[PDB]
């Protein structure tokens with residue numbers, strides 16, 4: 001049946017993206033009800049961003065400084081406030097294409113679909129994990145700020161990410177829709193380091209079930225281990241500790257394949273000590289850690 | 302700025318997906334104007350599919366055998382015809398969410414976004430290449446038939462794939478919207494083999510430019526080669542021959558990075574003869590061949 005990195009359909013989110021412009025600076029906004037959310041550095045010049053004072057910059061702006069465009073339709077801004085690092089523009093018209101939506105803050109390890117946008121126009125959609133060090137390995141050009149990360153539960157859009165900035169080596173940082181950064185980052189153009197990144201162990205295990213579901217069985221061994229013995233080896237290879245909550249959450253996949261989680265931990269223990277000896281798993285020469293159990297159940301059922 | 306496998310936003314296509322049911326058998330349809338396109342084996346029982354006679358099966362059906370559902374709204378079928386392996390249901394209502402659309406037949410090597418659907422409901426979106434042997438490495442469960450492949454040019458949806466069936470090892474086959482199979486395949490449940498798959502050389506080269514754009518330079522060498530010398534080595538590793546049309550098409554990327562195509566061919570020649578000596582390129586331990594030049598320009602500009 002096959003296994004691909006797969007994103008949520010982007011339609012409901014597409015109908016929310018607008019272009020916010022303040023002077024020269026123009027980026028993307030999320031239009032929900034009568035509010036446009038965007039990163040607050042839309043009110044900066046290239047120089048302000050080297051060491052901004054957003055409060056100072058925003059007092060100086062009036063409602064009229066803000067050009068919001070939804071297609072060929074302008075939008076009268078009739079208010080503005082700043083929630084942490086996001087800007088909130090009250091507008092005369094409520095968005096008729098506003099879906100049921102929630103704002104959530106995701107945990108490191110959870111995945112989400114990025115709708116990458118330029119000039120308030122949907123360009124493309126891909127899947128990302130929130131890394132342990134609170135970065136994402138996205139793909140963002142200049143103009144992509146405002147682009148959002150989301151998940152869908154049935155009809156409800158769970159917005160969890162808005163893109164702000166890029167760190168050394170094409171890794172990325174942003175906020176929830178409360179305007180709170182993920183990780184210890186600030187919307188200021190000064191040297192900031194990420195913190196070492198770990199491998200999301202529960203996610204690798206989820207992917208090995210995907211592999212088995214799909215007929216890749218070669219790594220399966222006749223052993224189990226204890227959580228304790230497994231975590232002593234994993235710690236050495238910079239894998240996250242596997243908790244009992246991780247085991248419980250892997251339950252469905254264990255049930256779908258009839259392979260106990262501690263048997264699959266036996267397989268992973270061996271792959272870390274020996275590598276793959278020139279062997280692939282779902283076509284990858286590396287262990288893949290950006291598929292959650294919830295992603296695997298979804299796509300393999 | 303980063304480099305991810307990225308799909309077109311799926312909104313315009315989302316508004317076209319319906320559920321077609323004939324007896325027990327129910328799959329997805331594409332609703333465009335007053336026509337619903339779906340795979341023709343919707344009129345089969347599990348047993349008919351072992352050796353169908355579609356003409357015989359379809360004569361027996363009347364317009365009323367066909368249940369088309371668009372949300373909670375049924376749709377009066379008022380006609381039916383069969384174009385090769387696709388079924389065309391004329392319906393009383395033209396789809397108001399019908400985008401500008403084209404039907405195109407893609408070449409092996411070209412990429413497209415799959416909108417994977419179950420019960421006429423968009424489930425997820427991913428990117429695929431048409432392989433040299435006219436298969437795709439998709440992810441499709443039972444119920445996914447009718448799901449479509451597309452590209453977007455500005456406002457125009459270029460529909461090129463409709464999913465029919467799965468071959469040995471989670472590879473997939475389908476038709477254009479004329480109902481013509483890609484590859485030598487038939488919509489019948491009997492043993493069929495794929496034909497050996499080659500590596501899309503021009504696509505690997507496109508991806509190496511992506512790598513260089515993104516700061517992965519380690520494989521860059523001080524050599525050029527001739528097309529001829531390169532194709533003599535590539536032929537041995539089951540890489541497609543690189544044509545002058547391939548070189549011409551790589552032009553923009555060569556221009557964006559100031560690396561001649563025959564210099565990058567010098568790099569690739571070395572990677573095939575030596576492998577990567579435990580080195581990654583954009584995080585991959587393998588050479589990636591499912592990004593077209595047109596995909597790389599897009600995402601790296």
Ligand SMILES: *[C@@](O)(C(N)=O)[C@H](C[C@H]1CCNC1=O)NC(=O)[C@@H]1[C@@H]2[C@H](CN1C(=O)[C@@H](NC(=O)NC(C)(C)C)C(C)(C)C)C2(C)C
Pocket residue numbers: 026027039041049140141142143144145146163164165166167168172186187188189190191192193302
């Ligand atoms: C901005 O949001 C936009 N309108 O697109 C933009 C996003 C993209 C620029 C290129 N890649 C992107 O992700 N964000 C910025 O330009 C932010 C903005 C100003 C600097 N900045 C950056 O992303 C810089 N990174 C940076 O300073 N990194 C450190 C690790 C902090 C040194 C830049 C050098 C431009 C990529 C703020 C307000 C942070």
Ligand SMILES: *[C@@](O)(C(N)=O)[C@H](C[C@H]1CCNC1=O)NC(=O)[C@@H]1[C@@H]2[C@H](CN1C(=O)[C@@H](NC(=O)NC(C)(C)C)C(C)(C)C)C2(C)C
Pocket residue numbers: 001327328340342350441442443444445446447464465466467468469473487488489490491492493494
């Ligand atoms: C069908 O379109 C649907 N309603 O979902 C379905 C698609 C998915 C089944 C599982 N994976 C899919 O991609 N297609 C079929 O069931 C088609 C259908 C009947 C058999 N068939 C298959 O895909 C089979 N493959 C097959 O027979 N492969 C050979 C190489 C030809 C032996 C099956 C064994 C069910 C996966 C036709 C009309 C071909």
Ligand SMILES: [Cl-]
Pocket residue numbers: 004005306
């Ligand atoms: Cl993928």
Ligand SMILES: [Cl-]
Pocket residue numbers: 005305306
């Ligand atoms: Cl990817």
Ligand code: NA
Pocket residue numbers: 058059060061062
């Ligand atoms: Na103000």
Ligand code: NA
Pocket residue numbers: 078079080081
């Ligand atoms: Na105000």
Ligand code: NA
Pocket residue numbers: 359360361362363
């Ligand atoms: Na008939």
Ligand code: NA
Pocket residue numbers: 379380381382
């Ligand atoms: Na008829």
